[PDB]
């Protein structure tokens, strides 16, 4: 059929992504015009799950992705008042169906947050930008991280105190940050260490502050699992699917 491999860039979606619609099909697709790359497009390449943002291919590079009509996680979000609980329990579930795809098949994803986490048309979050991803399990062996990655109110302790740790209670913090920011509209602390005031108060359990004041008893005992210092003491993702919160039926 000629003319179906002509796509026109009709708006920005925020190098830049480009809103592409097909000529001949109207298909709309997110094109992301651009070492890093080169990593960025193999870890697209082995990804496959229905919370995970599709890769279609690549072609300056031209990454060809999905399109997802419901925008950024981070526009659901009301400024210091966050949105539903039955909404953000909802969007927690599918952000970790897609955590424990992308955990086991070796990936993390390093950078989880509100502005990566998008939305299809069915409302389905999508986890999205594998440019800060690497692979941390080959040959059932498991590498320890160094590199400094991800966004300061999103990023665990231990990346700015231990010179190596592990990667996944690494990704499950930063979804208890996206987790807070969801039910209660703002982030705890610019950063956790003991100089931030904020994240002393919460290792203080001074849960009568903002934002813990505004989070109902049942999601903040998971947030005070997740958001424990010792990573080796931190819960897993096993673990939070047996939470009472996780399991709680819940509707508007
Ligand atoms: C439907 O709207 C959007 C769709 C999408 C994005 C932003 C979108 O929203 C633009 C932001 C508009 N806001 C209005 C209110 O507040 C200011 C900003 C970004 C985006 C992507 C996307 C796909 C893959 C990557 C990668 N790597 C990056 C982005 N796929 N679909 C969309």
Same mark, same amino acid.
């Given at each position: ?63 060809? %992705?999905?399109?997802?009509?419901? @925008? !950024? =996680? ?5 400024? +210091? ?5 039955? &909404? ?90 996206? %987790?807070?920011?969801?039910?209660? @509209? !703002? =982030? ?5 260490? +003991? ?5 002393? &108060? ?51």
């Amino acid at each position: 059929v000629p003319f179906v491999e002509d796509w026109d860039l009709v708006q920005t979606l925020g190098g830049e992504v480009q809103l592409a619609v097909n000529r001949v099909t109207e298909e709309a697709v997110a094109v992301k015009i651009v070492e890093n790359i080169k990593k960025e497009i193999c870890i697209n390449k082995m990804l496959n799950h229905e919370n995970v943002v599709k890769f279609y291919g690549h072609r300056i590079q031209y990454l060809f %992705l999905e399109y997802c009509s419901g @925008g !950024e =996680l981070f526009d659901r979000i009301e400024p +210091d008042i966050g949105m539903p609980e039955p &909404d953000a329990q909802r969007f927690f579930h599918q952000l970790m169906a897609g955590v424990v795809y992308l955990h086991g098949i070796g990936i993390t994803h390093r950078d989880i947050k509100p502005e990566n986490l998008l939305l299809d048309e069915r409302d389905n979050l999508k986890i999205s930008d594998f440019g800060l991803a690497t692979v941390f399990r080959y040959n059932n062996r498991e590498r320890l991280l160094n590199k400094m990655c991800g966004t300061l109110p999103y990023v665990a302790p231990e990346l700015l105190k231990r010179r190596e740790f592990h990667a996944e209670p690494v990704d499950v913090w930063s979804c208890g940050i996206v %987790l807070t920011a969801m039910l209660a @509209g !703002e =982030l705890p602390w610019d950063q956790p260490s +003991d100089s931030c005031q904020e994240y002393s &108060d919460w290792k203080e359990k001074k849960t009568y502050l903002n934002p813990w004041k505004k989070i109902d008893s049942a999601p903040l005992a998971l947030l005070h699992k997740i958001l424990v210092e010792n990573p080796s003491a931190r819960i897993t993702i096993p673990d939070i699917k047996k939470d009472r919160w996780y399991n709680k039926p819940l509707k508007k």
